[PDB]
Amino acid sequence: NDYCQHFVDTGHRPQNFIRDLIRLKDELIAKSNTPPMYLQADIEAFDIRELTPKFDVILLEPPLEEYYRKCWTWDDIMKLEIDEIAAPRSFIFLWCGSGEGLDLGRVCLRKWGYRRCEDICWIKTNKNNPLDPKAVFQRTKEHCLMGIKGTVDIDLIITEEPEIGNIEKPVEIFHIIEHFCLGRRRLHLFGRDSTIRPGWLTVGPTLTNSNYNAETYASYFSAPNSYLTGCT
Amino acid sequence: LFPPQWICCDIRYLDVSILGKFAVVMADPPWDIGTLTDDEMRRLNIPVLQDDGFLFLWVTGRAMELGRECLNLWGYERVDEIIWVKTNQLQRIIHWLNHGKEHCLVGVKGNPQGFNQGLDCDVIVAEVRSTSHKPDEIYGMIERLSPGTRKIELFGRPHNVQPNWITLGNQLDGIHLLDPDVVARFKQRYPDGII
Ligand SMILES: CC(C)[C@@H]1N(Cc2ccc(C(=O)NC[C@]3(O)CCCN(c4ncnc5[nH]ccc45)C3)c(O)c2)CC12CCC2
Numbered sequence: 240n241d242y243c244q245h246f247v248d249t250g251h252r253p254q255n256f257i258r259d260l261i262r263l264k265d266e267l268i269a270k271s272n273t274p275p276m277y278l279q280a281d282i283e284a285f286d287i288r289e290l291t292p293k294f295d296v297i298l299l300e301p302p303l304e305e306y307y308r309k310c311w312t313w314d315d316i317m318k319l320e321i322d323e324i325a326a327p328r329s330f331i332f333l334w335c336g337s338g339e340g341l342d343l344g345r346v347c348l349r350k351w352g353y354r355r356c357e358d359i360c361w362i363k364t365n366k367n368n369p370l371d372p373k374a375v376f377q378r379t380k381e382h383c384l385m386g387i388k389g390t391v392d393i394d395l396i397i398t399e400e401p402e403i404g405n406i407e408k409p410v411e412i413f414h415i416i417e418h419f420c421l422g423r424r425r426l427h428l429f430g431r432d433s434t435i436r437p438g439w440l441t442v443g444p445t446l447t448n449s450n451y452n453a454e455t456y457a458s459y460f461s462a463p464n465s466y467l468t469g470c471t
Numbered sequence: 472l473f474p475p476q477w478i479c480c481d482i483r484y485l486d487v488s489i490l491g492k493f494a495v496v497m498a499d500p501p502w503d504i505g506t507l508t509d510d511e512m513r514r515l516n517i518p519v520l521q522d523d524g525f526l527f528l529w530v531t532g533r534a535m536e537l538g539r540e541c542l543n544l545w546g547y548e549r550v551d552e553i554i555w556v557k558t559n560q561l562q563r564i565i566h567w568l569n570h571g572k573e574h575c576l577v578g579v580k581g582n583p584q585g586f587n588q589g590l591d592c593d594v595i596v597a598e599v600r601s602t603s604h605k606p607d608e609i610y611g612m613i614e615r616l617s618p619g620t621r622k623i624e625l626f627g628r629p630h631n632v633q634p635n636w637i638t639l640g641n642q643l644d645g646i647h648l649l650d651p652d653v654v655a656r657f658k659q660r661y662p663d664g665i666i
């Protein structure tokens with residue numbers, strides 16, 4: 240059965256037709272999860288160095304212009320000082336969309352000094368509702384690239400495409416990130432009120448409330464918790 | 472000449488100029504991760520094959536970046552990336568993660584025109600037939616985009632022979648050429664007939 244041909248006919252995307260114990264690691268993640276902390280910041284005009292200590296995971300989710308049919312160009316993004324706040328061995332997940340970010344985002348990663356190890360691809364289904372000039376196909380997926388520095392989950396996330404102008408990323412990304420057990424200092428740049436979450440330090444230009452306190456924060460990782468994988 | 476044609480050879484030594492110009496180029500190359508070394512990859516004579524047109528380049532692991540290099544080096548801009556979602560006979564999903572997909576870069580050269588941009592969508596779902604195989608569905612997608620036109624595949628295996636397609640592998644069964652202009656430039660470039 241050919242689904243590329245079917246979509247030509249009906250408008251249902253090939254992905255509209257995919258189908259379908261380890262519950263304890265979720266619980267251990269929860270125990271080791273710090274309080275949620277969330278700091279409002281107009282990140283353009285914000286010195287990243289103020290964000291401390293140095294992070295074990297950085298989830299970066301910049302408002303791409305392409306999300307709307309204040310935006311951040313890749314020109315804008317590629318000039319963040321992400322290396323300054325990463326940790327010697329640490330990770331990064333960068334939402335690139337499907338356009339130039341597929342390429343400019345790899346540049347970024349190399350710039351801040353990461354090398355890619357994973358290409359996690361969000362697949363958007365149009366079950367409940369069957370274009371760049373520079374495009375060739377209907378784009379129906381986004382890429383969240385995963386990079387490392389120093390030193391059971393799959394690389395697919397399938398959900399129904401969100402209502403137009405909804406921009407939130409599928410939360411499963413968090414479950415993929417957290418099931419890796421890469422430490423506890425976690426940072427979600429350009430988060431929003433809506434994404435605040437235990438175990439994470441959200442930082443963004445629309446957060447309507449703030450509780451972040453560099454010192455208060457560091458204390459959660461004061462010895463004897465420095466190198467917790469956060470799954471224990 | 473509409474039917475398949477193929478050339479068992481070494482794509483590193485064949486005077487690919489004799490093959491002319493193609494609307495679509497596709498390559499499923501054996502990346503060092505048969506093998507070609509990265510320079511051989513860089514050194515391939517892709518730029519002769521197209522004046523205007525599209526290139527489809529399969530990648531895995533770290534070819535994801537090198538392939539973006541070779542793509543750019545040969546003179547294409549990557550415009551789309553295609554994903555293949557690998558399923559079983561009942562439509563379920565067969566380093567740091569387990570991999571449910573393979574990747575295919577799409578590049579563009581010149582000012583190609585007449586194409587049906589937008590006909591299909593950048594995700595593919597089809598059964599994992601055999602190993603190392605790519606799904607016949609890509610020939611669907613590529614036909615609808617530039618129907619009727621000259622297409623050339625590189626590092627094809629004897630199954631990848633297709634109508635309108637000149638396959639180039641080193642497991643192909645000899646040489647089968649029917650297009651005159653090519654059959655021409657071949658005997659002129661190749662008199663005894665070995666590469
Ligand atoms: C996502 C893609 C990267 C991935 N690919 C990986 C792959 C697997 C098998 C073959 C293959 O065996 N191809 C036939 C062959 O003939 C055999 C020998 C080498 N090769 C040559 N042909 C002409 N001259 C040559 N000189 C040196 C080599 C040579 C071609 C291949 O090419 C690529 C497959 C995918 C598709 C999804 C996964």
